[PDB]
Each structure stands twice: as structure tokens, then as C-alpha cells.
Amino acid sequence: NYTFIIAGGGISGLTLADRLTEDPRVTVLVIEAGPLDRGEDGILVPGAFSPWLYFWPGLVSTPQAGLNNRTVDVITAQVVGGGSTINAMVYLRGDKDDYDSWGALGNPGWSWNSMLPYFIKSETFTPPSPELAAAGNITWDGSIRGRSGPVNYSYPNYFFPGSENWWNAANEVGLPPVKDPMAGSKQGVFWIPSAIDARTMTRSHARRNHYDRVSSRPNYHILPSHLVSKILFRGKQAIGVSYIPTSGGNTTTNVYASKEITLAAGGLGTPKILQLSGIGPRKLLNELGIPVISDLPGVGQNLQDQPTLTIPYTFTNNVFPNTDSLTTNATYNAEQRALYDSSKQGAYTIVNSLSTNIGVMSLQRAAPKSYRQIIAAARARSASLSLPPGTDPAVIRGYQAQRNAILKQFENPNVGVGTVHWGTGSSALVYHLKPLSRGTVNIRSTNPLDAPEIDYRTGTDPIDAQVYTSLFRKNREIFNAPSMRVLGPSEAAPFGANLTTDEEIYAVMRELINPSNAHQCCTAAMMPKDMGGVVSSEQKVYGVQGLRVADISFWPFQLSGSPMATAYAGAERLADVIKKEHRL
Ligand SMILES: Cc1cc2c(cc1C)N(C[C@H](O)[C@H](O)[C@H](O)COP(=O)(O)OP(=O)(O)OC[C@H]1O[C@@H](n3cnc4c(N)ncnc43)[C@H](O)[C@@H]1O)c1[nH]c(=O)[nH]c(=O)c1N2
Ligand SMILES: *[C@@H]1O[C@H](CO)[C@@H](O[C@@H]2O[C@H](CO)[C@@H](O)[C@H](O)[C@H]2NC(C)=O)[C@H](O)[C@H]1NC(C)=O
Ligand SMILES: *[C@@H]1O[C@H](CO)[C@@H](O)[C@H](O)[C@H]1NC(C)=O
Ligand SMILES: *[C@@H]1O[C@H](CO)[C@@H](O)[C@H](O)[C@H]1NC(C)=O
Ligand SMILES: *[C@@H]1O[C@H](CO)[C@@H](O)[C@H](O)[C@H]1NC(C)=O
Ligand SMILES: O=[N+]([O-])c1ccc(O)cc1
Ligand SMILES: O=[N+]([O-])c1ccc(O)cc1
Ligand SMILES: [Mg+2]
Ligand SMILES: [Mg+2]
Ligand SMILES: [Mg+2]
Numbered sequence: 325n326y327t328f329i330i331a332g333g334g335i336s337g338l339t340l341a342d343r344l345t346e347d348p349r350v351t352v353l354v355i356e357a358g359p360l361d362r363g364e365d366g367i368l369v370p371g372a373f374s375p376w377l378y379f380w381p382g383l384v385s386t387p388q389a390g391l392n393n394r395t396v397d398v399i400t401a402q403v404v405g406g407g408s409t410i411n412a413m414v415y416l417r418g419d420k421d422d423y424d425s426w427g428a429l430g431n432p433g434w435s436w437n438s439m440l441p442y443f444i445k446s447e448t449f450t451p452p453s454p455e456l457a458a459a460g461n462i463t464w465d466g467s468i469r470g471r472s473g474p475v476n477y478s479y480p481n482y483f484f485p486g487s488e489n490w491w492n493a494a495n496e497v498g499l500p501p502v503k504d505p506m507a508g509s510k511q512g513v514f515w516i517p518s519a520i521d522a523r524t525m526t527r528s529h530a531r532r533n534h535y536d537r538v539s540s541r542p543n544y545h546i547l548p549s550h551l552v553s554k555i556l557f558r559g560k561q562a563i564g565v566s567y568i569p570t571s572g573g574n575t576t577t578n579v580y581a582s583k584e585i586t587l588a589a590g591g592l593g594t595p596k597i598l599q600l601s602g603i604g605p606r607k608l609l610n611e612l613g614i615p616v617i618s619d620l621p622g623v624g625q626n627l628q629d630q631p632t633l634t635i636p637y638t639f640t641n642n643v644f645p646n647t648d649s650l651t652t653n654a655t656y657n658a659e660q661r662a663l664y665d666s667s668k669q670g671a672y673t674i675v676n677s678l679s680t681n682i683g684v685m686s687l688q689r690a691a692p693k694s695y696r697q698i699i700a701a702a703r704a705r706s707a708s709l710s711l712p713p714g715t716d717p718a719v720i721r722g723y724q725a726q727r728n729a730i731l732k733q734f735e736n737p738n739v740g741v742g743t744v745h746w747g748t749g750s751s752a753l754v755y756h757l758k759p760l761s762r763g764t765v766n767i768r769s770t771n772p773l774d775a776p777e778i779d780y781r782t783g784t785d786p787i788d789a790q791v792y793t794s795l796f797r798k799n800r801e802i803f804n805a806p807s808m809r810v811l812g813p814s815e816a817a818p819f820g821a822n823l824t825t826d827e828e829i830y831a832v833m834r835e836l837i838n839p840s841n842a843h844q845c846c847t848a849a850m851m852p853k854d855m856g857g858v859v860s861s862e863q864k865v866y867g868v869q870g871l872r873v874a875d876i877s878f879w880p881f882q883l884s885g886s887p888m889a890t891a892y893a894g895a896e897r898l899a900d901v902i903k904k905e906h907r908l
């Protein structure tokens with residue numbers, strides 16, 4: 325027996341296991357599908373970034389009805405440290421109203437102010453050098469960045485010169501410098517904080533900051549390369565799990581917990597454990613012959629991600645060096661790698677293909693002449709039109725509440741809906757942070773080795789195309805501003821200056837948008853049960869005792885930001901919630 329068993333050793337699972345094992349009377353077993361990383365350069369060194377080393381194999385979407393019925397490979401981590409081990413290290417909090425909105429959906433104790441102590445606890449910020457801060461326009465508010473917590477973050481110690489042209493261009497088209505994008509608003513441009521340990525300029529992933537750091541503890545146990553295949557119950561009490569080798573060896577083992585089972589298996593993993601365990605929609609469980617322990621139609625509903633668009637460019641006068649110099653100039657690449665190996669300086673401190681600065685914008689900043697028109701269309705349309713026909717009414721009610729919160733965010737000048745980035749080379753990136761579309765993740769069988777059916781339903785809500793087209797147009801403004809025109813950019817096929825109407829631009833976007841940046845969330849949502857929720861405000865699964873969801877399956881909806889910083893902080897908070905209930 326262990327005190328706690330955690331299914332998934334990703335960001336949430338390892339953060340929780342670390343904090344729970346601070347009490348030597350508490351024992352934890354973390355069961356993780358993937359192996360330990362080997363500290364290979366493709367993980368530790370930003371410039372060597374090789375995320376495909378630990379992608380979960382054999383996951384494909386359904387044909388995407390909103391994206392010309394395209395099928396895409398599904399990307400999620402399978403490795404100790406989860407997404408933190410293979411992500412692009414972008415470390416950003418959401419905006420105040422994200423957390424305040426989660427609270428307003430019926431979740432006492434959720435707000436920006438309740439999260440801020442956990443953001444601070446989570447991390448240690450290391451300031452950049454003064455000369456890079458001054459030259460780069462790096463700013464921060466030290467009063468709201470942690471100085472003593474486990475997650476290291478800082479910045480690269482270098483910037484490609486064309487990042488300057490893009491900064492000035494973004495300013496020219498109404499994206500001003502943001503003092504600190506961690507202070508609960510991020511309207512304009514800023515340096516991307518990176519989850520790097522500045523001692524060695526290497527990745528600070530959860531395997532290091534929430535396992536290696538505390539791995540002398542005998543009460544903190546890890547079992548890599550095993551899958552949690554089922555939750556075990558005595559009546560409605562979660563008492564243990566079954567696990568199998570990830571490789572599918574014909575062996576099953578049962579292990580038991582004296583206090584709780586925690587699911588931390590991610591947006592695409594947690595709902596599958598619940599559904600195989602008979603916690604999920606009666607209709608699906610009945611079809612597969614799985615006994616219903618708790619009839620929760622929200623399990624596998626409400627899937628969200630943050631779609632991405634790569635816009636290709638050619639330049640008549642780009643500045644050298646730039647990120648594509650690493651790929652197209654072997655001499656430059658070898659000299660920057662030798663520079664990093666010697667004094668830990670230069671381009672290898674930046675995640676490969678990224679630049680150092682980024683822009684975020686509200687709907688009114690993206691669409692200053694038309695945002696009210698997009699809000700009017702969204703307010704006019706029935707919430708239920710966004711969901712499959714015959715969606716459970718409780719799930720529709722939760723989606724209606726989310727939608728009302730997001731339409732308030734659309735009117736809010738201080739909440740982001742999209743991002744613009746330029747890596748300094750042949751492509752730009754435009755992310756959609758706040759889709760109104762909702763997808764599904766459902767098991768197809770009782771075989772725990774079978775991939776679930778993953779249907780992002782990207783672009784099924786027509787409002788999303790209007791928001792995304794506005795983001796595309798703002799990106800075009802940056803590239804046509806004086807500071808960027810000096811580099812001689814032009815959109816490459818299948819984009820181009822001759823695509824001038826919304827219709828022309830979005831027909832190409834429909835063919836190129838990726839449903840996912842591997843930010844899958846919200847498939848075991850924290851909302852009232854009568855709003856299609858799966859977990860309470862204490863993250864307890866409805867209808868059963870001793871069972872919580874820790875991973876970002878529990879989020880109601882996506883942030884103005886990428887998920888990692890909040891995945892850590894929310895696990896920091898859940899550790900304290902659990903310790904208080906037991907008296908640990
Ligand atoms: C390639 C790539 C790139 C990015 C990102 C992800 C990825 C994959 N993200 C997203 C971010 O990393 C992600 O949202 C968080 O890691 C989510 O943390 P969780 O704890 O929810 O799941 P996470 O995915 O971290 O952990 C879930 C774990 O559960 C395991 N698991 C699944 N099913 C299991 C089962 N049945 N039994 C046992 N273990 C099981 C998995 O193997 C995995 O390690 C990101 N975010 C960000 O803010 N900045 C960024 O730069 C990026 N970029
Ligand atoms: C990563 O963050 C941790 C946590 O603050 C830092 O660990 C500290 O390291 C210093 C010097 O090595 C020690 O004197 C402290 O006692 C450690 N503090 C704690 C709270 O453990 C580590 O320094 C960070 N990395 C950087 C570059 O600052
Ligand atoms: C996608 O597939 C369905 C039938 O499988 C079809 O009716 C629909 O027209 C297709 N969508 C597009 C945009 O081609
Ligand atoms: C920093 O901002 C100043 C003032 O707007 C500008 O002149 C400069 O080019 C910027 N540099 C970078 C690297 O963004
Ligand atoms: C290639 O990189 C080297 C090393 O910085 C540089 O001197 C050279 O001019 C670059 N060549 C081209 C063609 O970019
Ligand atoms: O290669 N990558 O960094 C990726 C690829 C796909 C994805 O959805 C997220 C990140
Ligand atoms: O700047 N931001 O808020 C971001 C940055 C990256 C990302 O994937 C999502 C949001
Ligand atoms: Mg210093
Ligand atoms: Mg300045
Ligand atoms: Mg200027």
C-alpha cells in the first residue's frame with residue numbers, strides 16, 4: 325500500500341508527488357507511461373530541441389469537419405516530466421480574468437488572487453544580464469515573480485538581430501511593450517519567459533525540478549514505462565489501480581492507496597482512465613459493456629486546444645544571422661554550438677526555430693474596427709449550435725456558461741485571444757488562444773492499449789474563423805510596417821498579398837491550420853455536475869470518493885497563455901487542498 329497513487333508523471337503528477345512527499349509519513353507511487361529521459365541534447369539544450377523523441381505513438385484525429393475533413397497526427401508527451409520534457413519551454417501565466425472566470429462558473433476558491441501565491445511558490449525567476457535587458461527591451465516586475473520555488477525560468481542570453489525589426493514593427497501597428505506578461509495582462513509585445521535553468525542554460529522540466537531535486541526521498545516512488553489501465557473501487561471508494569507495461573506485455577498488476585487515487589494522465593489520458601473505469605457517459609459505457617460507477621456525460625466532452633497557423637515568407641533582404649542560419653549555414657551552426665559548449669552563450673540558448681519576443685492581443689486590439697460585429701454574431705448564436713446534435717443538456721449548460729465568460733473576455737481590452745510570433749526566418753506563427761469550438765475524446769474499446777477517438781472539432785464554431793482571420797490580418801500589418809519592410813518580406817504560397825478578402829484568406833487557413841499545439845485540456849472539467857462538470861471545486865470526481873483530477877483535463881477552458889506555468893501552479897494549489905483535508 326501507498327498513501328497516494330498518481331496516474332501520470334507529467335507536470336501535474338510530479339508537482340503533486342513532490343509536495344505530498346514533503347511529509348515523511350506520506351508515501352506516493354507515480355505510474356508514468358513513458359521512460360525517464362536520458363538527458364540527451366534534444367531534451368536539455370534549447371537549440372537542439374527534438375520534441376519528437378517522446379511523442380505518444382499511434383494517435384491520429386478523426387477527419388476534421390471544420391478543416392476540409394483533414395486528419396492530423398495527435399501530439400502529446402509520453403515521458404517522465406510529460407509535456408515539460410518536450411515542450412518549447414514557453415512559460416507564461418494566463419490573464420487575471422481566466423482564473424476569475426473559472427471561479428464565476430461555480431468554483432469557490434478560483435481567482436487570480438487565489439492563484440498568485442501558487443504562481444510565486446512554483447518558481448525561481450533568474451533575471452537576464454543588464455546589457456541584454458537594456459538592448460533587448462526585457463522588462464519584468466520582480467514583486468510578482470517567484471524567487472525560491474522549484475521551476476527555474478529566465479530568458480535566452482542572446483537574440484537574433486531581426487527580432488529588433490519585428491519588435492519595432494509590432495509597436496508601429498499598436499502592440500506596445502508589456503511591462504510584465506506574468507502580471508495578469510499581456511497586451512502587446514514582450515520577451516518570452518523560458519523554463520531554462522540559467523546555471524547551465526538547460527531545460528528545467530518537471531523530471532528535474534519536481535523529481536530529481538527530491539529523489540533522495542524514500543517515500544517518493546516512480547514506476548516508468550507502465551500504464552494505469554483502470555481504477556479499482558470498494559463500492560464508490562477509489563482504492564487502487566491496475567497497471568500494465570506500456571509495451572503491452574500480457575501482465576496486469578493491482579496496487580492500492582490508503583487515502584486517494586489522483587489522475588494526472590493529461591487531457592487525452594485522464595478521460596480514457598475514467599471511461600475504462602466506468603466513470604463517463606452511460607451511453608458510451610453501455611455500448612462497450614462497461615459497468616457505470618458514475619454517470620458523468622462531461623467525461624471526454626469539452627476538449628480544447630490552441631490552434632496554430634504557420635505563414636511562410638521569403639525575403640529579399642533578411643538580416644544575418646537568423647534562426648534559419650542554424651539550418652542553412654553549417655558553419656554558423658557549428659560555431660554557435662561550440663560557443664554554447666564553451667561559455668553557454670549564443671543561439672543554442674533559444675529553443676530551435678523560435679525567437680525571443682512575442683505579441684498577444686485582445687479581440688479589440690486585433691480587430692479595432694469590427695470587434696463589436698464579431699461579439700454581436702457570437703452573442704446572437706445559440707450555444708448549442710457549437711456542439712454535436714443530441715449533446716447531453718448538462719454539457720450544453722456548461723458550454724453556455726463558458727461561452728458567456730468568453731464573450732465577456734472578447735469585450736475586455738485586457739484579455740488575449742491570439743498570439744503573433746516571428747522566429748526571424750522563413751515562417752511566422754499565429755495562435756488562436758480562445759476557440760469557442762469544442763471537441764471530444766472517447767474510448768473505442770475496453771482494450772487499454774487502444775488509442776481513443778480524438779475529434780478536435782477545430783473551426784466547427786464559425787465565430788472562430790472570424791477571430792482567426794483578424795489575427796492573420798494583424799500579423800500582415802506587422803510584416804508591412806516600416807521596420808519589417810526594410811527586410812523585403814513577402815508572404816509565400818499558399819498565402820500572398822493578392823489574398824485580400826476574408827473569404828480568400830480563410831480558405832487557405834482552413835487547409836493549413838493545425839488543430840493543436842499539444843495544449844489539450846478540459847476533458848474532465850471543473851464545473852458543477854448539472855453544468856456537465858466531472859470534478860468539484862476541490863477537483864474530486866462526482867459520484868465517487870478518494871478520486872481527483874490534477875492534470876489540465878480539469879480546466880473549464882483555455883487561457884490567454886500556454887498551459888505550462890498554470891499546470892505547475894494548479895498542482896501546487898491542489899497539493900495544499902489535499903494536505904488540508906487529510907491534515908498532512
Ligand atoms: C511538443 C509540445 C510542445 C508544447 C507543449 C506540449 C508539447 C507536447 N505545451 C503544452 C504543455 O506542456 C502541456 O499542456 C502540459 O504538459 C500539460 O500538463 P499535464 O500535467 O496536464 O499533462 P502532461 O502531458 O504533462 O503529463 C501527462 C502524463 O501522463 C502520462 N500518461 C498518459 N496516460 C497514462 C496512463 N494511462 N498511465 C500512466 N501515465 C499516463 C503521459 O505519458 C504524460 O507524461 C506547451 N505549453 C507551454 O506552456 N509552453 C510550451 O512551450 C508548450 N509547448
Ligand atoms: C533554480 O531555482 C532554485 C530554487 O530557488 C535555485 O536553488 C538555490 O541555489 C542556490 C545556489 O545554488 C542555493 O544557495 C539555494 O539554497 C537554493 N535555494 C533553494 C530554495 O533550494 C537555483 O539556484 C535556481 N537556478 C538559478 C540559475 O538561480
Ligand atoms: C466532410 O465529410 C462529409 C462526409 O464524410 C461531407 O459531407 C462534407 O461535405 C465534407 N466536408 C468538406 C468541407 O469537404
Ligand atoms: C528596444 O526598444 C527601442 C525603443 O522602442 C528600440 O529603438 C529598439 O530597436 C528596441 N530593440 C529591441 C531589440 O527590441
Ligand atoms: C555562414 O556562417 C558563418 C559563420 O558565422 C559566416 O561567417 C558566413 O558569412 C555565413 N555564410 C552565409 C552564406 O550566410
Ligand atoms: O514539434 N513541435 O514542437 C510541435 C509539433 C506539434 C504540436 O502540436 C506541438 C509542438
Ligand atoms: O504569449 N502567449 O500568451 C502565448 C505564447 C505561446 C503560446 O503557445 C500560447 C500563448
Ligand atoms: Mg544577474
Ligand atoms: Mg527599452
Ligand atoms: Mg518604435
Ligand code: NA
Pocket residue numbers: 453481669
Ligand atoms: Na551573456
